[PDB]
Write an enzyme that holds these catalytic residues in place. Structure first.
Site, PDB file in Angstrom:
ATOM      1  N   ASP A  71       0.772  -1.230   0.000  1.00 27.57           N
ATOM      2  CA  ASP A  71       0.000   0.000   0.000  1.00 27.57           C
ATOM      3  C   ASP A  71       0.815   1.298   0.000  1.00 27.57           C
ATOM      4  OD1 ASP A  71      -3.212   0.131   1.197  1.00 27.57           O
ATOM      5  OD2 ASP A  71      -2.074   1.982   1.064  1.00 27.57           O
ATOM      6  N   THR A  72       1.031   1.901  -1.172  1.00 29.45           N
ATOM      7  CA  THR A  72       1.787   3.140  -1.225  1.00 29.45           C
ATOM      8  C   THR A  72       1.061   4.360  -0.637  1.00 29.45           C
ATOM      9  OG1 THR A  72       1.066   3.621  -3.453  1.00 29.45           O
ATOM     10  CG2 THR A  72       3.130   2.369  -3.217  1.00 29.45           C
ATOM     11  N   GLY A  73      -0.252   4.247  -0.427  1.00 26.29           N
ATOM     12  CA  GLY A  73      -1.020   5.352   0.119  1.00 26.29           C
ATOM     13  C   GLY A  73      -1.001   5.344   1.631  1.00 26.29           C
TER      14      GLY A  73
HETATM   15  N1  LIG Z   1     -10.941  -1.683  -0.872  1.00 31.70           N
HETATM   16  C1  LIG Z   1      -9.861  -1.057  -1.305  1.00 31.70           C
HETATM   17  O1  LIG Z   1      -9.117  -1.532  -2.119  1.00 31.70           O
HETATM   18  O2  LIG Z   1      -9.722   0.209  -0.923  1.00 31.70           O
HETATM   19  C2  LIG Z   1     -10.530   0.891   0.066  1.00 31.70           C
HETATM   20  C3  LIG Z   1     -11.771   1.409  -0.682  1.00 31.70           C
HETATM   21  C4  LIG Z   1     -11.112   2.542  -1.405  1.00 31.70           C
HETATM   22  C5  LIG Z   1     -11.584   3.180  -2.553  1.00 31.70           C
HETATM   23  C6  LIG Z   1     -10.896   4.288  -3.014  1.00 31.70           C
HETATM   24  C7  LIG Z   1      -9.739   4.742  -2.357  1.00 31.70           C
HETATM   25  C8  LIG Z   1      -9.256   4.084  -1.219  1.00 31.70           C
HETATM   26  C9  LIG Z   1      -9.950   2.979  -0.750  1.00 31.70           C
HETATM   27  C10 LIG Z   1      -9.700   2.143   0.484  1.00 31.70           C
HETATM   28  C11 LIG Z   1      -8.287   1.854   0.864  1.00 31.70           C
HETATM   29  C12 LIG Z   1      -7.266   1.478   0.124  1.00 31.70           C
HETATM   30  N2  LIG Z   1      -6.029   1.271   0.864  1.00 31.70           N
HETATM   31  C13 LIG Z   1      -6.354   1.452   2.279  1.00 31.70           C
HETATM   32  C14 LIG Z   1      -6.274   0.185   3.157  1.00 31.70           C
HETATM   33  C15 LIG Z   1      -7.369  -0.799   2.780  1.00 31.70           C
HETATM   34  C16 LIG Z   1      -7.118  -1.685   1.741  1.00 31.70           C
HETATM   35  C17 LIG Z   1      -8.044  -2.594   1.340  1.00 31.70           C
HETATM   36  C18 LIG Z   1      -9.253  -2.617   1.956  1.00 31.70           C
HETATM   37  C19 LIG Z   1      -9.508  -1.734   3.003  1.00 31.70           C
HETATM   38  C20 LIG Z   1      -8.585  -0.820   3.420  1.00 31.70           C
HETATM   39  C21 LIG Z   1      -5.512   2.625   2.873  1.00 31.70           C
HETATM   40  C22 LIG Z   1      -5.429   3.839   1.857  1.00 31.70           C
HETATM   41  O3  LIG Z   1      -4.149   3.595   1.244  1.00 31.70           O
HETATM   42  C23 LIG Z   1      -5.380   5.204   2.572  1.00 31.70           C
HETATM   43  C24 LIG Z   1      -5.245   6.415   1.650  1.00 31.70           C
HETATM   44  C25 LIG Z   1      -5.315   7.701   2.495  1.00 31.70           C
HETATM   45  C26 LIG Z   1      -4.214   8.549   2.730  1.00 31.70           C
HETATM   46  C27 LIG Z   1      -4.314   9.658   3.604  1.00 31.70           C
HETATM   47  C28 LIG Z   1      -5.520   9.925   4.263  1.00 31.70           C
HETATM   48  C29 LIG Z   1      -6.624   9.102   4.000  1.00 31.70           C
HETATM   49  C30 LIG Z   1      -6.537   8.018   3.111  1.00 31.70           C
HETATM   50  N3  LIG Z   1      -4.325   5.314   3.619  1.00 31.70           N
HETATM   51  C31 LIG Z   1      -4.425   5.066   4.980  1.00 31.70           C
HETATM   52  O4  LIG Z   1      -5.335   4.554   5.558  1.00 31.70           O
HETATM   53  O5  LIG Z   1      -3.365   5.453   5.603  1.00 31.70           O
HETATM   54  C32 LIG Z   1      -2.916   4.924   6.819  1.00 31.70           C
HETATM   55  C33 LIG Z   1      -3.085   3.576   7.466  1.00 31.70           C
HETATM   56  C34 LIG Z   1      -1.654   3.411   8.037  1.00 31.70           C
HETATM   57  O6  LIG Z   1      -1.002   4.679   7.785  1.00 31.70           O
HETATM   58  C35 LIG Z   1      -1.964   5.686   7.661  1.00 31.70           C
HETATM   59  C36 LIG Z   1      -7.828   1.918   2.213  1.00 31.70           C
HETATM   60  O7  LIG Z   1      -8.443   2.329   3.168  1.00 31.70           O
END
Ligand SMILES: N[C@@H](O)O[C@@H]1Cc2ccccc2[C@@H]1C1CN[C@@](Cc2ccccc2)(C[C@H](O)[C@H](Cc2ccccc2)NC(=O)O[C@H]2CCOC2)C1=O
Lengths: 99, 99
Positions: free
Chosen positions: B25-27
């Site tokens: 997960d790069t985000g």
């Molecule tokens: N179903 C899936 O793939 O993604 C879900 C649904 C979705 C749709 C559009 C955009 C994003 C997403 C979700 C994602 C995608 N990746 C994570 C983790 C995840 C993966 C799969 C299923 C559920 C959840 C995280 C995402 O990268 C966000 C992107 C983000 C960045 C900054 C602020 C908010 C969001 N980052 C995040 O949560 O960051 C942190 C967790 C640990 O360090 C901090 C999500 O919450």
């Protein structure tokens, strides 16, 4: 370009005439943009991740330019804290993960 | 290796002698794993995602093998939908985005 992960992988995208800053996210299946007005009709959808779920409006066949590379696909619009470009559009610009 | 994004970038990680599947997960700034037992003390950490903030437990200096590559760093444990390998560990194994 080769992007390192020492810092958040942010890039400039251009959609609907305006330029924006978005985060390239390999973990996201879809693409979500902050509240904005896009043309066409939409379908409600609920997306969830860390923190829970949010309601978004789904627009199909939207054209986005990612670092000059045009891409076309489904774009979700809703209360996201940051614009996120997911896998649906990353594959279109030929983005890969290497290590 | 080079990982395309046509499907989810899932890898198997080894932590505590056992294998688990995780998503590259790069985000995500940090690495968050589903509930499990890790050694030592933990300190609190609030992290924000798509649906808001959650409180997780932070464990430092944890040995984790990702796709055969050994990494030693901070791991967060909490109510995450899936095991997430974030930037803190992606940089350790030399992971970059290319397009
Ligand atoms: N179903 C899936 O793939 O993604 C879900 C649904 C979705 C749709 C559009 C955009 C994003 C997403 C979700 C994602 C995608 N990746 C994570 C983790 C995840 C993966 C799969 C299923 C559920 C959840 C995280 C995402 O990268 C966000 C992107 C983000 C960045 C900054 C602020 C908010 C969001 N980052 C995040 O949560 O960051 C942190 C967790 C640990 O360090 C901090 C999500 O919450």
């Amino acid at each position: 370009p080769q992007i390192t992960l020492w810092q958040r992988p942010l890039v400039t995208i251009k959609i609907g005439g305006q330029l924006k800053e978005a985060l390239l996210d390999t973990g996201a299946d879809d693409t979500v943009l902050e509240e904005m007005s896009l043309p066409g009709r939409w379908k409600p959808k609920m997306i969830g991740g860390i923190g829970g779920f949010i309601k978004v409006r789904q627009y199909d066949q939207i054209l986005i330019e990612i670092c000059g590379h045009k891409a076309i696909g489904t774009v979700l619009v809703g209360p996201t804290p940051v614009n996120i470009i997911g896998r649906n559009l990353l594959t279109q610009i030929g983005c890969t993960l290497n290590f």
